[PDB]
Amino acid sequence: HGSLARAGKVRAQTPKVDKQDKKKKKRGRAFRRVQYTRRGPNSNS
Amino acid sequence: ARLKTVQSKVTKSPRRPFEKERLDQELKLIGTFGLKNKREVWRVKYTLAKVRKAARELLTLEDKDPKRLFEGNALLRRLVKIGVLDETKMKLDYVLGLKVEDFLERRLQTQVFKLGLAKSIHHARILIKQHHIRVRRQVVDVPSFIVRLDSQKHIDFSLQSPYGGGRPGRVKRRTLR
Amino acid sequence: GKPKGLCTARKLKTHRQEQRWNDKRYKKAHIGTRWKSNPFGGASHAKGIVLEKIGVEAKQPNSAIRKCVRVQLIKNGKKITAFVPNDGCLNFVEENDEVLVSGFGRSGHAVGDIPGVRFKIVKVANTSLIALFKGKKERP
Amino acid sequence: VTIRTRKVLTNKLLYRKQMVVEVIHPGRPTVPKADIREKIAKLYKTTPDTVIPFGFESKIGGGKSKGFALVYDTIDFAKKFEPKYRLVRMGLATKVEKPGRKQRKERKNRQKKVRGTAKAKVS
RNA sequence: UACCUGAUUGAUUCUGUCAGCGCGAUAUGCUCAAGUAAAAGAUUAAGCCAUGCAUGCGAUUCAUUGAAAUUGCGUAC
RNA sequence: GGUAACGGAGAAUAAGGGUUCGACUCCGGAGAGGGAGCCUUAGAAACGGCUACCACGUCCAAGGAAGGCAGCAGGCGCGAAACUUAUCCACUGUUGUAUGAGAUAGUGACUAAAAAUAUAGUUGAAUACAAAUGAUUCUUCGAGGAGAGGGCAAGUCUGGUGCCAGCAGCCGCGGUAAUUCCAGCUCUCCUAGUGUAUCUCGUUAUUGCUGCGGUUAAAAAGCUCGUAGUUGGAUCUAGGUUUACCUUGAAUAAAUCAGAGUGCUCAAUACAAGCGCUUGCU
């Protein structure tokens, strides 16, 4: 059970993964325009 | 010594931060009139609500009240000169019918692309930012700038802009050099 | 029923003032011992030193050991227990350490499944615990 | 570089004239105050050293700009009712080199401690 | 804009609080293209202060224009 | 007796009725480390005046001599908490060369208004200023904060851990097939801002005068007498002397709040300004 010594266990066991690179998203009015044109939003399944 | 500087707020946040109806409606308004942020539209809503609340407070009084006369005539005057209120509709019982779209249409950003000075509203905004629009011999770089009825017909290209008469832009100068 | 006479203002006002003391909020805000009883003395943040670290059995039905640290405030020397947010952050807290502590959110009441813990650490060794978790910085 | 004048008041009790001068230099930079001075002098058929343009601020995008002007009856009245800094700026008078207030205050403070004629000597 | 929503139950209707929600004050995290106004050691310690300044300017001029000094005035604003 | 109390003008919130605060730019009061006593004067119980005591310092050749930043700027402490040991009388007043009053520049995401990331900077000019910087004209070149189960807008995608690590204001997720964690990939809110903590107001008709509730949810005294308090029946000219109360005026510093006009480019703001033509009118 809990023992006060197992700190960081899950994040230590966590397999390490890197990030991905994407074109700098449009900022401000361009972001609003892109969102409007694109107009669930995140329907994975 | 120095005094307190007088400040005042123009934006009032909605009581409900999230509701699909308001969210979608306001997004649609942003799309219709090119704005920067929801604060832009809340500013117009709160100006409209100040107008409507003052008009309602006035209408609570009878017709010929001195204050009612003065304030209502002044408010109808201001809306007329901006070009929001109709000049054949002179009453507060009728000013209680307006919307944010009305004031938003009276922004320079709309008129630029409306009168053919820009293709898109985004193009209009970037032109104003780059100082290629002028009004009554006055280069206004403020998209929310409020265009009166009189100045409605007094906007053309800047007298210095490459597109309004002037030195070629940086790209053109690079190419020539 | 309440009095309704046109000359009973004194009775109404006195009764209302007397009954305001039976209100938890009014009594809590006007008792007079608030400053002496509250560890922060009416402030929002405080500074202290670490003494030891403990694990608290989270309440039922939750099963876990929440990792808090016993701290001593510098303003008054009172002993409190402060929670160390985010994963594996107790490592960044070593005995005899200077910490900035703030309220947990419920104004002197315990939060969640952590029993008897009403403060939380906002900085350790003059560093933001969130920065330490996010790797934006390192232990001085 | 058209110049125009408005709000002209003849100050006999100050032996000058006060107006508002507007200079139009579209495209071009702000007018040199010397050029403004020459144009005002030609306008008012009076010496170019007896005319004082000051406080000239330009509007955005070139073009309009506003700054005040003082046309003086004679150089005596000019360098009679005027602060020294303006005369230094236009060269009528000259700046006098003076120590900073910090150093001068220190000097007077030490001069307080000393009595008699040694006050001048101490420095 | 005279507004509510989640949580006691196998389910229901209440009482009731807790939580959410809007504004403002103070502190603080991350971050911040340039500009305009602009608060700013009140909160606790009316605690202690190095160092510099913050009150000095008609009558009386045998010093070299006016120094020094005596008066007068102010320093209670 | 207490006040983590200077009073007011006012501030925040805000249907109405209110609740809370107000050290702070204006007005009144008080104090100059704590007390006390005085000189001068029209005016002081003055402290950038003196005298003594107490607390705490400073220089001494040890005989003596001194100090009062809750003025400006800075320093140490205290703390969650607050700026340059700068330039000037050029502006605003004091009787006017003098004015750390006052006016300039510095640090400054307190804050209020206005606004770049798509379809800035830089070189030297011109302006301003007591000098300056930075603003206003030309010319050389040349995206971050939170979030994504419900409240509440937005993923039952991929791997680890198996009630651990962690999240979570609340309800609740995590026990070997996690939409809530740890990651990776995805989207929503707001936006150069966005979170967190404490507190005020609304929400709260959960302090109820408007306006709550008391059979069983908290709440009718066991019952009666009784002073103060509160509240008290109808009735005086309908027809064909005192008060209380209501109406209207008088006396009522500004600044703020409400409120006309005016393109400071808009707005917060500010209280400006706007036409002819020069010797000007409003």
PDB file of N, CA and C (backbone and C1' of nucleotides) in Angstrom, chain B residues 2 7-8 10 18 23 36-39 43 71 78 123 138-142 144-146 148 167 173-174 177, chain F residues 25-26 102 111-116 118-119 139 141-142 153-154 190-192 259-261 263 265 268-270:
ATOM      1  N   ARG B   2      -1.133  65.934  -7.092  1.00  0.00           N
ATOM      2  CA  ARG B   2      -1.865  65.352  -8.209  1.00  0.00           C
ATOM      3  C   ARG B   2      -3.173  64.756  -7.705  1.00  0.00           C
ATOM      4  N   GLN B   7     -11.218  57.222 -14.445  1.00  0.00           N
ATOM      5  CA  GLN B   7     -11.293  56.070 -15.327  1.00  0.00           C
ATOM      6  C   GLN B   7     -12.739  55.606 -15.392  1.00  0.00           C
ATOM      7  N   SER B   8     -13.019  54.707 -16.331  1.00  0.00           N
ATOM      8  CA  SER B   8     -14.350  54.139 -16.477  1.00  0.00           C
ATOM      9  C   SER B   8     -14.272  52.902 -17.356  1.00  0.00           C
ATOM     10  N   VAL B  10     -15.927  50.006 -19.949  1.00  0.00           N
ATOM     11  CA  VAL B  10     -16.822  49.949 -21.095  1.00  0.00           C
ATOM     12  C   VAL B  10     -17.287  48.527 -21.381  1.00  0.00           C
ATOM     13  N   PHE B  18     -20.315  30.569 -20.236  1.00  0.00           N
ATOM     14  CA  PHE B  18     -20.452  29.542 -21.268  1.00  0.00           C
ATOM     15  C   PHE B  18     -21.926  29.205 -21.462  1.00  0.00           C
ATOM     16  N   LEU B  23     -22.445  31.703 -27.241  1.00  0.00           N
ATOM     17  CA  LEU B  23     -21.146  31.455 -27.850  1.00  0.00           C
ATOM     18  C   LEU B  23     -21.249  31.458 -29.370  1.00  0.00           C
ATOM     19  N   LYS B  36     -11.527  41.671 -33.180  1.00  0.00           N
ATOM     20  CA  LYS B  36     -10.336  41.037 -32.633  1.00  0.00           C
ATOM     21  C   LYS B  36     -10.654  40.058 -31.516  1.00  0.00           C
ATOM     22  N   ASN B  37     -11.623  40.366 -30.667  1.00  0.00           N
ATOM     23  CA  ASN B  37     -11.850  39.562 -29.478  1.00  0.00           C
ATOM     24  C   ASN B  37     -13.275  39.795 -28.997  1.00  0.00           C
ATOM     25  N   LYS B  38     -13.732  38.908 -28.112  1.00  0.00           N
ATOM     26  CA  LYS B  38     -15.098  39.001 -27.613  1.00  0.00           C
ATOM     27  C   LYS B  38     -15.307  40.270 -26.803  1.00  0.00           C
ATOM     28  N   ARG B  39     -14.236  40.819 -26.230  1.00  0.00           N
ATOM     29  CA  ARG B  39     -14.345  42.111 -25.567  1.00  0.00           C
ATOM     30  C   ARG B  39     -14.822  43.175 -26.540  1.00  0.00           C
ATOM     31  N   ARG B  43     -18.110  45.302 -25.657  1.00  0.00           N
ATOM     32  CA  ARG B  43     -18.077  46.758 -25.638  1.00  0.00           C
ATOM     33  C   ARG B  43     -19.292  47.336 -26.351  1.00  0.00           C
ATOM     34  N   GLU B  71     -32.439  64.592 -23.255  1.00  0.00           N
ATOM     35  CA  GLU B  71     -31.652  63.371 -23.404  1.00  0.00           C
ATOM     36  C   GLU B  71     -32.073  62.575 -24.631  1.00  0.00           C
ATOM     37  N   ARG B  78     -27.158  61.639 -31.640  1.00  0.00           N
ATOM     38  CA  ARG B  78     -25.874  60.947 -31.694  1.00  0.00           C
ATOM     39  C   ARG B  78     -25.965  59.693 -32.552  1.00  0.00           C
ATOM     40  N   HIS B 123      -8.192  41.962 -45.157  1.00  0.00           N
ATOM     41  CA  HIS B 123      -7.405  42.865 -45.988  1.00  0.00           C
ATOM     42  C   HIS B 123      -7.647  44.317 -45.596  1.00  0.00           C
ATOM     43  N   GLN B 138      -7.406  62.459 -43.086  1.00  0.00           N
ATOM     44  CA  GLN B 138      -7.061  62.074 -41.722  1.00  0.00           C
ATOM     45  C   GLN B 138      -6.816  60.572 -41.701  1.00  0.00           C
ATOM     46  N   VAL B 139      -5.551  60.169 -41.592  1.00  0.00           N
ATOM     47  CA  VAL B 139      -5.160  58.756 -41.616  1.00  0.00           C
ATOM     48  C   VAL B 139      -5.521  58.145 -40.265  1.00  0.00           C
ATOM     49  N   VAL B 140      -6.645  57.433 -40.205  1.00  0.00           N
ATOM     50  CA  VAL B 140      -7.070  56.756 -38.984  1.00  0.00           C
ATOM     51  C   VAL B 140      -6.657  55.293 -39.063  1.00  0.00           C
ATOM     52  N   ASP B 141      -5.876  54.844 -38.078  1.00  0.00           N
ATOM     53  CA  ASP B 141      -5.356  53.482 -38.034  1.00  0.00           C
ATOM     54  C   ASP B 141      -6.116  52.637 -37.017  1.00  0.00           C
ATOM     55  N   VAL B 142      -7.293  53.101 -36.609  1.00  0.00           N
ATOM     56  CA  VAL B 142      -8.053  52.470 -35.534  1.00  0.00           C
ATOM     57  C   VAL B 142      -9.237  51.726 -36.143  1.00  0.00           C
ATOM     58  N   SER B 144     -11.722  50.003 -34.953  1.00  0.00           N
ATOM     59  CA  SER B 144     -12.977  50.300 -34.277  1.00  0.00           C
ATOM     60  C   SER B 144     -13.383  51.758 -34.414  1.00  0.00           C
ATOM     61  N   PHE B 145     -12.555  52.586 -35.048  1.00  0.00           N
ATOM     62  CA  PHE B 145     -12.907  53.983 -35.250  1.00  0.00           C
ATOM     63  C   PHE B 145     -14.335  54.079 -35.754  1.00  0.00           C
ATOM     64  N   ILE B 146     -15.054  55.070 -35.265  1.00  0.00           N
ATOM     65  CA  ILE B 146     -16.487  55.153 -35.507  1.00  0.00           C
ATOM     66  C   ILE B 146     -16.750  56.178 -36.600  1.00  0.00           C
ATOM     67  N   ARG B 148     -19.020  58.448 -38.722  1.00  0.00           N
ATOM     68  CA  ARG B 148     -20.279  59.172 -38.682  1.00  0.00           C
ATOM     69  C   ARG B 148     -20.975  59.132 -40.043  1.00  0.00           C
ATOM     70  N   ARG B 167       5.635  56.554 -52.916  1.00  0.00           N
ATOM     71  CA  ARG B 167       6.801  55.747 -53.243  1.00  0.00           C
ATOM     72  C   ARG B 167       6.423  54.266 -53.256  1.00  0.00           C
ATOM     73  N   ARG B 173      10.675  48.443 -54.050  1.00  0.00           N
ATOM     74  CA  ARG B 173      11.988  49.076 -53.988  1.00  0.00           C
ATOM     75  C   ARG B 173      13.104  48.038 -54.025  1.00  0.00           C
ATOM     76  N   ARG B 174      12.921  46.910 -53.333  1.00  0.00           N
ATOM     77  CA  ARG B 174      13.888  45.822 -53.421  1.00  0.00           C
ATOM     78  C   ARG B 174      14.048  45.361 -54.862  1.00  0.00           C
ATOM     79  N   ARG B 177      15.886  47.977 -56.978  1.00  0.00           N
ATOM     80  CA  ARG B 177      17.300  48.060 -56.627  1.00  0.00           C
ATOM     81  C   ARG B 177      18.044  46.809 -57.082  1.00  0.00           C
TER      82      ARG B 177
ATOM     83  P     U F  25      -5.881  62.662   1.424  1.00  0.00           P
ATOM     84  O5'   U F  25      -5.256  63.821   0.529  1.00  0.00           O
ATOM     85  C5'   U F  25      -4.095  63.582  -0.259  1.00  0.00           C
ATOM     86  C4'   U F  25      -4.001  64.511  -1.446  1.00  0.00           C
ATOM     87  C3'   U F  25      -5.286  65.246  -1.821  1.00  0.00           C
ATOM     88  O3'   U F  25      -4.970  66.532  -2.352  1.00  0.00           O
ATOM     89  C1'   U F  25      -4.597  63.904  -3.633  1.00  0.00           C
ATOM     90  P     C F  26      -4.868  67.807  -1.380  1.00  0.00           P
ATOM     91  O5'   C F  26      -6.377  68.270  -1.190  1.00  0.00           O
ATOM     92  C5'   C F  26      -7.006  69.120  -2.135  1.00  0.00           C
ATOM     93  C4'   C F  26      -8.441  69.382  -1.760  1.00  0.00           C
ATOM     94  C3'   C F  26      -8.683  69.765  -0.308  1.00  0.00           C
ATOM     95  O3'   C F  26      -8.454  71.139  -0.055  1.00  0.00           O
ATOM     96  C1'   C F  26     -10.200  68.068  -0.931  1.00  0.00           C
ATOM     97  P     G F 102       3.324  69.270  -4.111  1.00  0.00           P
ATOM     98  O5'   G F 102       3.721  70.215  -5.327  1.00  0.00           O
ATOM     99  C5'   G F 102       2.918  71.330  -5.685  1.00  0.00           C
ATOM    100  C4'   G F 102       3.497  72.054  -6.873  1.00  0.00           C
ATOM    101  C3'   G F 102       3.878  71.175  -8.054  1.00  0.00           C
ATOM    102  O3'   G F 102       2.772  70.882  -8.890  1.00  0.00           O
ATOM    103  C1'   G F 102       5.662  72.650  -7.555  1.00  0.00           C
ATOM    104  P     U F 111      -3.597  45.209 -12.953  1.00  0.00           P
ATOM    105  O5'   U F 111      -4.593  46.427 -13.184  1.00  0.00           O
ATOM    106  C5'   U F 111      -5.754  46.572 -12.383  1.00  0.00           C
ATOM    107  C4'   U F 111      -6.424  47.903 -12.609  1.00  0.00           C
ATOM    108  C3'   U F 111      -6.668  48.298 -14.058  1.00  0.00           C
ATOM    109  O3'   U F 111      -7.750  47.618 -14.686  1.00  0.00           O
ATOM    110  C1'   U F 111      -5.675  50.103 -12.955  1.00  0.00           C
ATOM    111  P     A F 112      -9.245  48.204 -14.704  1.00  0.00           P
ATOM    112  O5'   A F 112      -9.142  49.588 -15.489  1.00  0.00           O
ATOM    113  C5'   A F 112     -10.183  50.546 -15.360  1.00  0.00           C
ATOM    114  C4'   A F 112     -10.115  51.641 -16.398  1.00  0.00           C
ATOM    115  C3'   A F 112     -10.051  51.211 -17.851  1.00  0.00           C
ATOM    116  O3'   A F 112     -11.305  50.800 -18.365  1.00  0.00           O
ATOM    117  C1'   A F 112      -8.502  52.955 -17.478  1.00  0.00           C
ATOM    118  P     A F 113     -11.385  49.932 -19.715  1.00  0.00           P
ATOM    119  O5'   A F 113     -10.975  50.957 -20.861  1.00  0.00           O
ATOM    120  C5'   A F 113     -11.776  52.096 -21.137  1.00  0.00           C
ATOM    121  C4'   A F 113     -11.105  53.033 -22.111  1.00  0.00           C
ATOM    122  C3'   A F 113     -10.707  52.440 -23.450  1.00  0.00           C
ATOM    123  O3'   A F 113     -11.796  52.319 -24.347  1.00  0.00           O
ATOM    124  C1'   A F 113      -8.948  53.790 -22.616  1.00  0.00           C
ATOM    125  P     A F 114     -11.764  51.213 -25.511  1.00  0.00           P
ATOM    126  O5'   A F 114     -10.505  51.617 -26.401  1.00  0.00           O
ATOM    127  C5'   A F 114     -10.545  52.758 -27.245  1.00  0.00           C
ATOM    128  C4'   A F 114      -9.268  52.924 -28.031  1.00  0.00           C
ATOM    129  C3'   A F 114      -8.780  51.708 -28.797  1.00  0.00           C
ATOM    130  O3'   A F 114      -9.470  51.489 -30.012  1.00  0.00           O
ATOM    131  C1'   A F 114      -6.964  52.711 -27.673  1.00  0.00           C
ATOM    132  P     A F 115      -9.123  50.189 -30.888  1.00  0.00           P
ATOM    133  O5'   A F 115      -7.577  50.351 -31.233  1.00  0.00           O
ATOM    134  C5'   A F 115      -6.945  49.459 -32.141  1.00  0.00           C
ATOM    135  C4'   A F 115      -5.449  49.435 -31.970  1.00  0.00           C
ATOM    136  C3'   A F 115      -4.767  48.192 -32.535  1.00  0.00           C
ATOM    137  O3'   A F 115      -3.485  48.523 -33.067  1.00  0.00           O
ATOM    138  C1'   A F 115      -4.377  48.319 -30.204  1.00  0.00           C
ATOM    139  P     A F 116      -2.935  47.753 -34.367  1.00  0.00           P
ATOM    140  O5'   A F 116      -2.052  46.571 -33.765  1.00  0.00           O
ATOM    141  C5'   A F 116      -2.232  45.230 -34.195  1.00  0.00           C
ATOM    142  C4'   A F 116      -0.972  44.667 -34.798  1.00  0.00           C
ATOM    143  C3'   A F 116      -1.034  43.204 -35.203  1.00  0.00           C
ATOM    144  O3'   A F 116      -1.639  43.029 -36.473  1.00  0.00           O
ATOM    145  C1'   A F 116       0.975  43.630 -34.009  1.00  0.00           C
ATOM    146  P     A F 118       0.094  35.134 -38.437  1.00  0.00           P
ATOM    147  O5'   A F 118      -0.625  35.090 -39.858  1.00  0.00           O
ATOM    148  C5'   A F 118      -1.895  35.695 -40.045  1.00  0.00           C
ATOM    149  C4'   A F 118      -1.780  37.128 -40.507  1.00  0.00           C
ATOM    150  C3'   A F 118      -2.331  37.433 -41.891  1.00  0.00           C
ATOM    151  O3'   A F 118      -3.741  37.577 -41.912  1.00  0.00           O
ATOM    152  C1'   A F 118      -0.212  38.453 -41.640  1.00  0.00           C
ATOM    153  P     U F 119      -4.595  36.969 -43.130  1.00  0.00           P
ATOM    154  O5'   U F 119      -4.195  37.876 -44.377  1.00  0.00           O
ATOM    155  C5'   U F 119      -4.616  39.229 -44.454  1.00  0.00           C
ATOM    156  C4'   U F 119      -4.165  39.887 -45.736  1.00  0.00           C
ATOM    157  C3'   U F 119      -4.531  39.172 -47.026  1.00  0.00           C
ATOM    158  O3'   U F 119      -5.868  39.413 -47.429  1.00  0.00           O
ATOM    159  C1'   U F 119      -2.264  39.839 -47.108  1.00  0.00           C
ATOM    160  P     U F 139      10.013  59.054 -47.330  1.00  0.00           P
ATOM    161  O5'   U F 139      11.550  58.645 -47.353  1.00  0.00           O
ATOM    162  C5'   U F 139      12.511  59.501 -47.947  1.00  0.00           C
ATOM    163  C4'   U F 139      13.866  59.335 -47.313  1.00  0.00           C
ATOM    164  C3'   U F 139      14.377  57.910 -47.194  1.00  0.00           C
ATOM    165  O3'   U F 139      14.899  57.401 -48.408  1.00  0.00           O
ATOM    166  C1'   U F 139      14.728  59.037 -45.153  1.00  0.00           C
ATOM    167  P     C F 141      17.268  51.786 -48.939  1.00  0.00           P
ATOM    168  O5'   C F 141      17.501  50.385 -48.220  1.00  0.00           O
ATOM    169  C5'   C F 141      18.778  49.766 -48.236  1.00  0.00           C
ATOM    170  C4'   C F 141      19.086  49.106 -46.917  1.00  0.00           C
ATOM    171  C3'   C F 141      18.168  47.962 -46.515  1.00  0.00           C
ATOM    172  O3'   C F 141      18.522  46.735 -47.130  1.00  0.00           O
ATOM    173  C1'   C F 141      18.434  49.437 -44.688  1.00  0.00           C
ATOM    174  P     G F 142      17.382  45.724 -47.637  1.00  0.00           P
ATOM    175  O5'   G F 142      16.730  45.174 -46.293  1.00  0.00           O
ATOM    176  C5'   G F 142      17.513  44.496 -45.321  1.00  0.00           C
ATOM    177  C4'   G F 142      16.764  44.351 -44.021  1.00  0.00           C
ATOM    178  C3'   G F 142      15.353  43.795 -44.137  1.00  0.00           C
ATOM    179  O3'   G F 142      15.319  42.381 -44.219  1.00  0.00           O
ATOM    180  C1'   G F 142      15.318  45.734 -42.791  1.00  0.00           C
ATOM    181  P     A F 153     -21.799  23.637 -21.733  1.00  0.00           P
ATOM    182  O5'   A F 153     -21.034  24.842 -22.447  1.00  0.00           O
ATOM    183  C5'   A F 153     -21.280  25.179 -23.807  1.00  0.00           C
ATOM    184  C4'   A F 153     -20.011  25.121 -24.620  1.00  0.00           C
ATOM    185  C3'   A F 153     -19.321  23.765 -24.625  1.00  0.00           C
ATOM    186  O3'   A F 153     -19.805  22.954 -25.680  1.00  0.00           O
ATOM    187  C1'   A F 153     -17.759  25.456 -24.039  1.00  0.00           C
ATOM    188  P     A F 154     -19.875  21.359 -25.537  1.00  0.00           P
ATOM    189  O5'   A F 154     -18.461  20.873 -26.080  1.00  0.00           O
ATOM    190  C5'   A F 154     -17.941  21.351 -27.313  1.00  0.00           C
ATOM    191  C4'   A F 154     -16.438  21.275 -27.323  1.00  0.00           C
ATOM    192  C3'   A F 154     -15.858  19.949 -26.850  1.00  0.00           C
ATOM    193  O3'   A F 154     -15.794  18.979 -27.882  1.00  0.00           O
ATOM    194  C1'   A F 154     -14.807  21.719 -25.694  1.00  0.00           C
ATOM    195  P     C F 190     -14.991  33.494 -25.657  1.00  0.00           P
ATOM    196  O5'   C F 190     -13.693  34.197 -25.064  1.00  0.00           O
ATOM    197  C5'   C F 190     -13.663  34.660 -23.722  1.00  0.00           C
ATOM    198  C4'   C F 190     -12.268  35.046 -23.302  1.00  0.00           C
ATOM    199  C3'   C F 190     -11.532  35.980 -24.240  1.00  0.00           C
ATOM    200  O3'   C F 190     -11.920  37.330 -24.075  1.00  0.00           O
ATOM    201  C1'   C F 190     -10.075  34.266 -23.454  1.00  0.00           C
ATOM    202  P     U F 191     -11.667  38.384 -25.255  1.00  0.00           P
ATOM    203  O5'   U F 191     -10.085  38.369 -25.462  1.00  0.00           O
ATOM    204  C5'   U F 191      -9.220  38.973 -24.511  1.00  0.00           C
ATOM    205  C4'   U F 191      -7.794  38.497 -24.654  1.00  0.00           C
ATOM    206  C3'   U F 191      -7.032  39.008 -25.862  1.00  0.00           C
ATOM    207  O3'   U F 191      -6.527  40.315 -25.661  1.00  0.00           O
ATOM    208  C1'   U F 191      -6.660  36.678 -25.598  1.00  0.00           C
ATOM    209  P     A F 192      -6.310  41.311 -26.901  1.00  0.00           P
ATOM    210  O5'   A F 192      -4.815  41.826 -26.714  1.00  0.00           O
ATOM    211  C5'   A F 192      -3.737  40.904 -26.576  1.00  0.00           C
ATOM    212  C4'   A F 192      -3.204  40.882 -25.166  1.00  0.00           C
ATOM    213  C3'   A F 192      -2.364  42.094 -24.769  1.00  0.00           C
ATOM    214  O3'   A F 192      -2.590  42.410 -23.396  1.00  0.00           O
ATOM    215  C1'   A F 192      -1.074  40.132 -24.536  1.00  0.00           C
ATOM    216  P     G F 259     -25.854  59.451 -17.511  1.00  0.00           P
ATOM    217  O5'   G F 259     -26.116  60.988 -17.840  1.00  0.00           O
ATOM    218  C5'   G F 259     -27.427  61.490 -18.060  1.00  0.00           C
ATOM    219  C4'   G F 259     -27.447  62.999 -18.010  1.00  0.00           C
ATOM    220  C3'   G F 259     -26.602  63.715 -19.060  1.00  0.00           C
ATOM    221  O3'   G F 259     -27.270  63.891 -20.300  1.00  0.00           O
ATOM    222  C1'   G F 259     -26.074  64.568 -16.931  1.00  0.00           C
ATOM    223  P     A F 260     -26.440  63.903 -21.680  1.00  0.00           P
ATOM    224  O5'   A F 260     -26.317  65.447 -22.072  1.00  0.00           O
ATOM    225  C5'   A F 260     -27.294  66.065 -22.899  1.00  0.00           C
ATOM    226  C4'   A F 260     -26.830  67.390 -23.465  1.00  0.00           C
ATOM    227  C3'   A F 260     -25.921  67.348 -24.684  1.00  0.00           C
ATOM    228  O3'   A F 260     -26.604  67.098 -25.897  1.00  0.00           O
ATOM    229  C1'   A F 260     -25.101  68.939 -23.145  1.00  0.00           C
ATOM    230  P     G F 261     -25.771  66.701 -27.215  1.00  0.00           P
ATOM    231  O5'   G F 261     -24.563  67.744 -27.260  1.00  0.00           O
ATOM    232  C5'   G F 261     -24.733  69.036 -27.830  1.00  0.00           C
ATOM    233  C4'   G F 261     -23.450  69.836 -27.843  1.00  0.00           C
ATOM    234  C3'   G F 261     -22.311  69.290 -28.688  1.00  0.00           C
ATOM    235  O3'   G F 261     -22.464  69.548 -30.072  1.00  0.00           O
ATOM    236  C1'   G F 261     -21.471  69.997 -26.596  1.00  0.00           C
ATOM    237  P     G F 263     -16.879  68.089 -33.603  1.00  0.00           P
ATOM    238  O5'   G F 263     -15.397  67.517 -33.685  1.00  0.00           O
ATOM    239  C5'   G F 263     -15.139  66.274 -34.321  1.00  0.00           C
ATOM    240  C4'   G F 263     -14.156  65.449 -33.534  1.00  0.00           C
ATOM    241  C3'   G F 263     -12.690  65.663 -33.898  1.00  0.00           C
ATOM    242  O3'   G F 263     -11.878  65.624 -32.724  1.00  0.00           O
ATOM    243  C1'   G F 263     -13.300  63.389 -34.280  1.00  0.00           C
ATOM    244  P     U F 265      -5.204  63.852 -32.199  1.00  0.00           P
ATOM    245  O5'   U F 265      -6.388  62.941 -32.748  1.00  0.00           O
ATOM    246  C5'   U F 265      -7.370  63.480 -33.620  1.00  0.00           C
ATOM    247  C4'   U F 265      -8.055  62.398 -34.412  1.00  0.00           C
ATOM    248  C3'   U F 265      -8.897  61.421 -33.611  1.00  0.00           C
ATOM    249  O3'   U F 265     -10.187  61.931 -33.313  1.00  0.00           O
ATOM    250  C1'   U F 265      -7.514  60.231 -35.124  1.00  0.00           C
ATOM    251  P     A F 268     -15.506  58.314 -23.355  1.00  0.00           P
ATOM    252  O5'   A F 268     -14.408  57.896 -22.279  1.00  0.00           O
ATOM    253  C5'   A F 268     -14.463  56.630 -21.640  1.00  0.00           C
ATOM    254  C4'   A F 268     -13.221  56.359 -20.830  1.00  0.00           C
ATOM    255  C3'   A F 268     -12.786  57.465 -19.887  1.00  0.00           C
ATOM    256  O3'   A F 268     -13.525  57.464 -18.678  1.00  0.00           O
ATOM    257  C1'   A F 268     -10.903  56.596 -21.050  1.00  0.00           C
ATOM    258  P     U F 269     -14.369  58.756 -18.235  1.00  0.00           P
ATOM    259  O5'   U F 269     -13.256  59.862 -17.975  1.00  0.00           O
ATOM    260  C5'   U F 269     -12.890  60.769 -19.001  1.00  0.00           C
ATOM    261  C4'   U F 269     -11.396  60.864 -19.170  1.00  0.00           C
ATOM    262  C3'   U F 269     -10.849  62.284 -19.165  1.00  0.00           C
ATOM    263  O3'   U F 269     -10.555  62.747 -17.857  1.00  0.00           O
ATOM    264  C1'   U F 269     -10.082  61.161 -21.099  1.00  0.00           C
ATOM    265  P     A F 270     -11.395  63.954 -17.208  1.00  0.00           P
ATOM    266  O5'   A F 270     -10.752  65.258 -17.852  1.00  0.00           O
ATOM    267  C5'   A F 270      -9.344  65.406 -17.956  1.00  0.00           C
ATOM    268  C4'   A F 270      -8.985  66.344 -19.076  1.00  0.00           C
ATOM    269  C3'   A F 270      -9.854  67.587 -19.189  1.00  0.00           C
ATOM    270  O3'   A F 270      -9.408  68.617 -18.324  1.00  0.00           O
ATOM    271  C1'   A F 270      -9.642  66.565 -21.316  1.00  0.00           C
TER     272        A F 270
END
